[PDB]
Amino acid sequence: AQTVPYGIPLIKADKVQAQGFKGANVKVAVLDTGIQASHPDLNVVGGASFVAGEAYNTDGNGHGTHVAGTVAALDNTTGVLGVAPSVSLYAVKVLNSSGSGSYSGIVSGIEWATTNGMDVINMSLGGASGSTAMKQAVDNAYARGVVVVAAAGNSGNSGSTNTIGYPAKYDSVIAVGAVDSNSNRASFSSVGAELEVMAPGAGVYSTYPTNTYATLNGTSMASPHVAGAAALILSKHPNLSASQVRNRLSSTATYLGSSFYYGKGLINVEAAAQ
Ligand SMILES: *[C@@]1(/[C]=[C]/C2=[C][C]=[C][C]=[C]2)=ON1#C[C]
Ligand SMILES: [Ca+2]
Numbered sequence: 001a002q003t004v005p006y007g008i009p010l011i012k013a014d015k016v017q018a019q020g021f022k023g024a025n026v027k028v029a030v031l032d033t034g035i036q037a038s039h040p041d042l043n044v045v046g047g048a049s050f051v052a053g054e055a056y057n058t059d060g061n062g063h064g065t066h067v068a069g070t071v072a073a074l075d076n077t078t079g080v081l082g083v084a085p086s087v088s089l090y091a092v093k094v095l096n097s098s099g100s101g102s103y104s105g106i107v108s109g110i111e112w113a114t115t116n117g118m119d120v121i122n123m124s125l126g127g128a129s130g131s132t133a134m135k136q137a138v139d140n141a142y143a144r145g146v147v148v149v150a151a152a153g154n155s156g157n158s159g160s161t162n163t164i165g166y167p168a169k170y171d172s173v174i175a176v177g178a179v180d181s182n183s184n185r186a187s188f189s190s191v192g193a194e195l196e197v198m199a200p201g202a203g204v205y206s207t208y209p210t211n212t213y214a215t216l217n218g219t220s221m222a223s224p225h226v227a228g229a230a231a232l233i234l235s236k237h238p239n240l241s242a243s244q245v246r247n248r249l250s251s252t253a254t255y256l257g258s259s260f261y262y263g264k265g266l267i268n269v270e271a272a273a274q
Contacts, residue, residue, distance in 0.1 A: 028087045174250075179202070
């Protein structure tokens, strides 16, 4: 039997999938700790590794496999179901088993995706500081027609202090926050003027290293929901540019409260997919 994570219906992904739009022919690159390619509920078509000693098709952490399942866990009679189960998944390892990677390794992963015709890039990662080479890579990937989604950060808030990390803080990147099954903001979701949209990030169940499934919390779980929504929209309107898809997502989001806390609200793919 296949479990359907509460995040799929909450963002109305099940409604557009039912119309027969599931991300087919859309290339998605998950810049993470790799992906357990052998996982029976995932189909990795390719990728690259910029982490010394580790192949792209192995995940010693569990993070990238989890994020990848949220985006494209196969629609079958087992495991879970992804937001866009027909998307072409590319694992780009830019982080190691400990969940860390250099700036060089990240911008390299960004360039590889842009150069190899990736339609969407998900970066469930962030830092307190950015780089000029990082900003350059992301801006050029966006201006070239790639949708760039990044986790906003798990530094909750302070008292009127922007806690959005990099690259989420960049103009060309969609900063994603986290809500729970009740659609309420999760207390760990970063806050700031760059917050753009929200998605399921608390108690998210997805694929996990060595043919199993686990539950994780974090804006690193929310991000793949928007990356998958972007893939769903593209599989329906392949004529859209990055900014139009981006626009669809934020203009049709369900308002939830102050934008400094919820951005434009929780995404709605049925409305976004037109
Ligand atoms: C996720 C993470 C992510 C990030 C961090 C910082 C900044 C940005 C992004 O979540 N993990 C896990 C669970
Ligand atoms: Ca499945």
